Design an enzyme around this catalytic site. Structure first.
Site, mmCIF file in Angstrom:
data_model
loop_
_atom_site.group_PDB
_atom_site.id
_atom_site.type_symbol
_atom_site.label_atom_id
_atom_site.label_comp_id
_atom_site.label_asym_id
_atom_site.label_seq_id
_atom_site.Cartn_x
_atom_site.Cartn_y
_atom_site.Cartn_z
ATOM 1 N N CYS C 87 40.722 21.953 -5.567
ATOM 2 C CA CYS C 87 40.180 20.892 -4.798
ATOM 3 C C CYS C 87 39.960 21.038 -3.372
ATOM 4 O O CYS C 87 39.227 20.418 -2.663
ATOM 5 C CB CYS C 87 41.236 19.540 -5.138
ATOM 6 S SG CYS C 87 40.953 19.126 -6.831
ATOM 7 N N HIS C 346 34.326 12.871 -6.942
ATOM 8 C CA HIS C 346 35.236 13.912 -6.339
ATOM 9 C C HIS C 346 34.585 15.214 -7.138
ATOM 10 O O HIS C 346 34.930 15.761 -7.976
ATOM 11 C CB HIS C 346 36.550 13.712 -6.982
ATOM 12 C CG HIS C 346 37.494 14.763 -6.599
ATOM 13 N ND1 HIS C 346 37.820 15.113 -5.444
ATOM 14 C CD2 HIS C 346 38.257 15.409 -7.574
ATOM 15 C CE1 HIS C 346 38.830 16.105 -5.503
ATOM 16 N NE2 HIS C 346 39.026 16.281 -6.587
ATOM 17 N N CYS C 376 44.720 17.157 -2.051
ATOM 18 C CA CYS C 376 45.804 17.652 -2.988
ATOM 19 C C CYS C 376 44.944 18.800 -3.952
ATOM 20 O O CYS C 376 44.086 18.640 -4.571
ATOM 21 C CB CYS C 376 46.423 16.352 -3.792
ATOM 22 S SG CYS C 376 45.381 15.490 -4.990
ATOM 23 N N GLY C 378 45.671 21.138 -7.092
ATOM 24 C CA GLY C 378 46.487 21.387 -8.576
ATOM 25 C C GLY C 378 47.246 22.831 -8.600
ATOM 26 O O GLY C 378 46.860 23.736 -7.688
HETATM 27 C C1 COA Z 1 39.882 9.249 -15.741
HETATM 28 C C2 COA Z 1 38.911 10.144 -16.576
HETATM 29 C C3 COA Z 1 39.738 10.966 -17.298
HETATM 30 C C4 COA Z 1 38.058 9.360 -17.626
HETATM 31 O O1 COA Z 1 37.382 10.224 -18.472
HETATM 32 P P1 COA Z 1 36.542 9.233 -19.413
HETATM 33 O O2 COA Z 1 37.246 8.082 -20.061
HETATM 34 O O3 COA Z 1 36.504 10.001 -21.057
HETATM 35 O O4 COA Z 1 35.124 8.968 -18.940
HETATM 36 P P2 COA Z 1 34.596 7.470 -19.226
HETATM 37 O O5 COA Z 1 33.508 7.555 -18.657
HETATM 38 O O6 COA Z 1 34.194 7.268 -20.861
HETATM 39 O O7 COA Z 1 35.643 6.184 -18.929
HETATM 40 C C5 COA Z 1 35.102 5.217 -18.131
HETATM 41 C C6 COA Z 1 35.263 3.944 -19.050
HETATM 42 O O8 COA Z 1 35.868 2.958 -18.425
HETATM 43 C C7 COA Z 1 34.943 1.840 -17.793
HETATM 44 N N1 COA Z 1 35.511 1.848 -16.396
HETATM 45 C C8 COA Z 1 36.072 3.065 -15.797
HETATM 46 N N2 COA Z 1 36.551 2.631 -14.521
HETATM 47 C C9 COA Z 1 35.963 1.484 -14.137
HETATM 48 C C10 COA Z 1 36.315 0.724 -12.845
HETATM 49 N N3 COA Z 1 36.848 1.262 -11.885
HETATM 50 N N4 COA Z 1 35.567 -0.565 -13.152
HETATM 51 C C11 COA Z 1 35.012 -1.137 -14.035
HETATM 52 N N5 COA Z 1 34.952 -0.518 -15.305
HETATM 53 C C12 COA Z 1 35.262 0.916 -15.452
HETATM 54 C C13 COA Z 1 33.697 2.290 -17.793
HETATM 55 O O9 COA Z 1 32.585 1.462 -17.863
HETATM 56 C C14 COA Z 1 33.650 3.210 -19.143
HETATM 57 O O10 COA Z 1 33.519 2.262 -20.224
HETATM 58 P P3 COA Z 1 34.422 2.721 -21.608
HETATM 59 O O11 COA Z 1 35.776 2.227 -21.521
HETATM 60 O O12 COA Z 1 33.535 1.942 -22.796
HETATM 61 O O13 COA Z 1 34.474 4.235 -21.910
HETATM 62 C C15 COA Z 1 38.252 11.043 -15.449
HETATM 63 O O14 COA Z 1 37.702 10.381 -14.485
HETATM 64 C C16 COA Z 1 38.933 12.449 -15.483
HETATM 65 O O15 COA Z 1 38.666 13.365 -15.760
HETATM 66 N N6 COA Z 1 39.906 12.172 -14.464
HETATM 67 C C17 COA Z 1 40.604 13.483 -13.951
HETATM 68 C C18 COA Z 1 40.188 14.119 -12.740
HETATM 69 C C19 COA Z 1 40.747 15.075 -12.172
HETATM 70 O O16 COA Z 1 41.553 15.773 -13.008
HETATM 71 N N7 COA Z 1 40.697 15.814 -10.999
HETATM 72 C C20 COA Z 1 41.227 16.686 -10.340
HETATM 73 C C21 COA Z 1 42.744 16.187 -10.083
HETATM 74 S S1 COA Z 1 43.535 16.900 -8.566
#
Ligand code: COA
Ligand code: COA
Ligand code: COA
Ligand code: COA
Lengths: 390, 388, 390, 390
Positions: C87, C346, C376, C378
């Protein structure tokens, strides 16, 4: 010992990655197996063997015909097996299931076919290992069902061979496909497909959706857009995306028993199996398959071409379907009166029994005495069967 | 008027990823189709239809039975199709080919089986797309041929179910495997497999394979009891007491008895009866039990009337249970060994043991025979052969 | 001896499988490199070396940074190489590019980052061969960028470690996330992102589509969905899909030159690189990464925590961002004044230079003298850089 | 401000699918990191940062350089990152690690490289989905390391361009390869590789195997068999399988510290880093990379070509290595006195630091004063470094 078809049923022919996008073939077959037994009053515990043809069973598990029977209530004491004769698999199972009762090795047979091209996976041999270089992930649908293994080109290219020797123009092939679409929309609105189609409940996470209509049928198919489509398999060819059969999912089967066995149960059978035949041809012109196959079936039954009152001819391609009609010389007004595979759809493993359902239920709806169903098989083969009404 | 087997042939049962590691199944079948026609004097242009069972055709193209026929000289006028009844595919094709001539729809049929587990690819459905997360690459050999779809466990686990109710100890199952191994080495050194095996030329130079490579020369018992169980950490079935993964093909020539007299052919045997019965998928190894009792019933034979028996040895527990159930003399069962030592090509084992059944009956002058196999998913197939 | 940033630019941070679903990473970098040179009047023939960080270059070919330079007009006389510090890659390249001129080995440096998680392929080792058994096709994005190699769980689980001992409730984290969401779109509607974002032309077969707005920003971000989301990585966790950063594609870079070189060219630089630092922490609590890294950067520059006028803190997770703010004690009103990576997006390889663009262009717009950007990383690491105005 | 190399080490260069067939790259790097710190008496708790170049990290997880440091005993307080400049990655890390101490941001640096082409997986993008048709599983080794992304052909094809313009006959390239083979076997039998090679224990379930000898070296390589090999990249070309470098796995690194710090620790350093350089050229003629790079490195150090006593020039191809010798005019008897990558092997990520280990330990073995290591980089680049003895 004669052998009559007591009842028959089929699922709605879904589109590629459509209603049956994630439905395995045995789930569609189990619904059909459960339907033919209800339509004849026969219980599941009486089925001796289930015979379902399938061309793409990769990823479905051990013996997909066994899974479709066990889920449909067929007991474990009965047996089940699959078959692969490409596009003639669905109809050959009825012929093979007929032979089970003809030799005396069975009494009640559920014979038909099933297919799920949407669930066809990509495969690649990786046991020896790929030391260096890129390799191909082979689509089983195109390779094991849509690519001739002797010359390498697609099933549309061998249709180009049929489009040349018989000299069928692009406009003539476009007029055959659009006519098949209009004959399908007329039969669907008039409810002529309701008897053959058994509803299938697609269980989903967001609610179950009951599918009972052929999704491939285009409502209001015109001809100005049929001539605007580019050819798919040859830059200077005539076969396009509209004049050829598509990729489809579905299932179909029938109940097979002797004539003396149906009379004991007081069942009015759909038709009597009089004869059948399968003949091979040049793999370059596999579309000519139904030509010697239908001539051999009629000869075994003792019928002239003019004796047929109803004909179902699988429409794999516009060029192939026109060539078979122009050679056999039969009346086109009695050929595919409710459309063909160009409009309804072409599930390879199930199209043999699918058009047989359309053949059986249309003969009794109109009171036809003699029928004939036939299909073209890839690799230079053809299958045909004759049905006489009771 | 009946239906006789004029000739038969088979390739040497190769090991998994061994001699036939990169040989497609249809290439092995074409050699067999060319051999059964050669051993009977029948030309390829006379074959009406070839019926070859195969369980793993993924990646081989359109109709592998059609490819095996075209390369073997069968003309385009004939037809071809495949079939899948798992392990009973090779023997059921002979029954299906028998029915083609019985109803009068054909005259000459080449029926048998083929398999190439080494060429079994890995598959995965990717049409819908994997947006996120990793996915599984499914082995077609393990999934579509060696995993029961109703309960989820391997075909070795269904042998554990047979190993419990009959209460067959590991030492008794180990003694069955070593005996089958020793009975296999005797036939291989004595050349009793040469007649049935047709040489196959695997095209750094061509290598001709004509001997069953799976047979272990000098199989002992001190190492049979030291092997860990393969399918259950507290089980009895291991790698030695169970059948292995193998490649090969086998077929036979089917024709009418009145048709054989016209050609002056001395057939190997007459097909008198056949049967296929299903059982509990938890105990698929019991498949040959009702199947063999129904086949003898259709022909009108008692269990004691059989002079030679070939029973496919998918597992030591299943093979011992069938023998203790049917009560037939074990000295006439697998006189040249079984699938534990020779090998188990799923699609071809039905016709493989039929070749061993046919050539041993005429070699010894046996009148009545019986071949049978256990089918996955709770099924069993059997066929009876009477000599001419 | 100083080293100033003459100009900087970045593409709009696209959503996962959104506008940049099929755009390679080097195509996004070339647009930035063509933008970093044009906004300062510096020609491509003067660039000594381009330094672009990237974490997922699998399938893009030999040295994607070299491809991004050649497409942007940089001549073959220059050199190019890639870098991977997860990152903090986008910000570390600026520090690495600064060292090229500090030692006297270069004069003009284009340093930044790029990422394209939508183009991240699935991989599996198959050279030795899989003789028996099924095997897994591993997603390079999850494995090489989203899975801790020491303990095996996702980066959402290491955020749970910050969520347990630090005792940050879900409602407080939702109030921090909603505040970051509202601050990001406000900058978009008021055109506060237009100066830093360079338009990217997504070439399409059915017509080109110009992308110039961060699509990941949720328009009208409320709280009714923040409290209704289920935990994503642990059934008893607190981080969900809204309070955590998403998967995004994009690029960012900057022009690096000595202060005396900018005065000769008459260029007014965006900021002066005063110091930088990188410190490692416990990989279980990677969110604390920016804590020791920022304390060392301020110590090298000679600045107190209260001397900062504007602060950009990458929002990988809501829990990790809250823990850093309360420990360093800096004013949260000057931290991520225009939002963060949870709403803007990101791109792992590019987020380091992405927030630096937001840091640089906002300081003079508001008249800020001293800044501090940090992220930050990983595996227990943190990066920091201090910027002083001209 | 000077910077000396206190110690260095490397693993035995294994063959493709050989001893290191299933050994991950970070496992090979951890052995080197633990060896370079022991040979200088420096503890792991004093390492400021680990800098390891790697070109193929697909499938290894988050930051393979971090994994190699944590397993080698480096504490979590230190940082680690990777880099990709293709074949010059291993040597550039030493130059980049040198710049960390030159600017005053670090004191002890472990810089080098690692590579494991045997563990390079096959990748394919599958997020959008393959609706129909076969697709390619791309080899990351061939694509991301052995295929020029601008013209599409292999690194052997751009060597054919060097084999044409300089007019180097097949016999001359074959005579250069056999000479390099004989110089490699002589050093291995005479134990001239024992000091630089640290034994690696390949842990296995069937017993541990200690690897301590370069497996790629062919013992007794003649020229009657060198002329019998078919050309690999062009049917009418000169580059074959013998006159070019092979695919190999391995690692190498070195310990970097200030000169005044080594005198306090009583360490006798191998050499003083005087200068370094990297210049880019036309990607069609990448083999000319070391030509301006070596002339620029000597120019910064203030040395003439005749002032060098020992030279290590990476032998990626026979045509490129002969072209560098014909232009610089240096004595070939002092160039690769113990062989080169044609015989020892060419780990892309590690070849930069691999030949530096052979360069450093050979200068003290014979008492050479000044040295020079250089490599050719794909995509039209070259790196060079000058070494002065203490
Ligand atoms: C959090 C994470 C795991 C989500 O992956 P995911 O859930 O499989 O992807 P999705 O798009 O299907 O999830 C979004 C869902 O929530 C809803 N939603 C999410 N955030 C929302 C928000 N802030 N406001 C309103 N609705 C939201 C979306 O409409 C979508 O609908 P669903 O519940 O029917 O699926 C993903 O953002 C991620 O990979 N995070 C880790 C990133 C990371 O590790 N970075 C490095 C770290 S240093
Ligand atoms: C021909 C085939 C490749 C179709 O796939 P395709 O090339 O992607 O063409 P599609 O059917 O998906 O439809 C493509 C276009 O044609 C148009 N189209 C298709 N059928 C049409 C019709 N009947 N009327 C009017 N327009 C039509 C669609 O609207 C679509 O327009 P779009 O490009 O803007 O989306 C596939 O069905 C096939 O392989 N058939 C082979 C048949 C066969 O092998 N049979 C074996 C029996 S021996
Ligand atoms: C799993 C299966 C394929 C065996 O694979 P395996 O576990 O790798 O065991 P292998 O056959 O490859 O041989 C493994 C070991 O057994 C030992 N071994 C094998 N056969 C032996 C024998 N006959 N005697 C003594 N030792 C033997 C070998 O020396 C080898 O030792 P090693 O591991 O140190 O190299 C086998 O149990 C199986 O599934 N067969 C299919 C059964 C089936 O489903 N039939 C269906 C019909 S209904
Ligand atoms: C040639 C190349 C493309 C692949 O060929 P390959 O698959 O490795 O060739 P193989 O290993 O299968 O065997 C080659 C034959 O040549 C012989 N051979 C190879 N090198 C030899 C040598 N130096 N001396 C004598 N004989 C030799 C081998 O023994 C072998 O004999 P065989 O025919 O019985 O197999 C690969 O070696 C290569 O050149 N890669 C380029 C690496 C690179 O460019 N790195 C970046 C630098 S810029």
């Amino acid at each position: 010992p004669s052998i009559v078809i007591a009842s028959a049923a089929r699922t709605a022919v879904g589109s590629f990655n459509g209603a049956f996008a994630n439905t395995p073939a045995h789930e569609l077959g189990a619904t059909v197996i459960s339907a033919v037994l209800e339509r004849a009053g026969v219980a599941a515990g009486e089925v001796n063997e289930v015979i379902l043809g399938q061309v793409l069973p990769a990823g479905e598990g051990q013996n997909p015909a066994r899974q479709a029977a066990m889920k449909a209530g067929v007991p474990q004491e009965a047996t089940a097996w699959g078959m692969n004769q490409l596009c003639g698999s669905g109809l050959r199972a009825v012929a093979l299931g007929m032979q089970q009762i003809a030799t005396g090795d069975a009494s009640i047979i559920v014979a038909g076919g099933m297919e799920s091209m949407s669930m066809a996976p990509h495969c690649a041999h990786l046991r020896g290992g790929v030391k260096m270089g890129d390799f191909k992930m082979i689509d089983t649908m195109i390779k094991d069902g849509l690519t001739d293994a002797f010359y390498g080109y697609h099933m549309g290219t061998t249709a180009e061979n049929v489009a040349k020797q018989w000299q069928l123009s692009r406009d003539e092939q476009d007029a055959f496909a659009v006519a098949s679409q209009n004959k399908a929309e007329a039969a669907q609105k008039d409810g002529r497909f309701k008897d053959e189609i058994v509803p299938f409940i697609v269980k989903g996470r967001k609610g179950d959706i009951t599918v009972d209509a052929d999704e491939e049928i285009r409502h209001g198919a015109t001809l100005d857009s049929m001539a605007k489509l580019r050819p798919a398999f040859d830059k200077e060819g005539t076969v396009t995306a509209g004049n050829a059969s598509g990729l489809n999912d579905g299932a179909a089967a029938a109940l097979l028993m002797s004539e003396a066995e149906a009379s004991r149960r007081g069942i009015q059978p759909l038709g009597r199996i009089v004869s059948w035949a399968t003949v091979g041809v040049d793999p370059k012109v596999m579309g000519t398959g139904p030509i010697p196959a239908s001539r051999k079936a009629l000869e075994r039954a003792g019928w002239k071409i003019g004796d047929l009152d109803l004909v179902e001819a699988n429409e794999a391609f516009a060029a192939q379907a026109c060539a078979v009609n122009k050679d056999l010389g039969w009346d086109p007004s009695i050929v595919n009166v409710n459309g063909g595979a160009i409009a309804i759809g072409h599930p390879i493993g199930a199209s043999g029994a699918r058009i047989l359902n359309t053949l059986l239920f249309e003969m009794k709806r109109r009171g036809a005495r003699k029928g004939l169903a036939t299909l073209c098989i890839g690799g230079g083969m053809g299958v045909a069967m004759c049905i006489e009404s009771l």
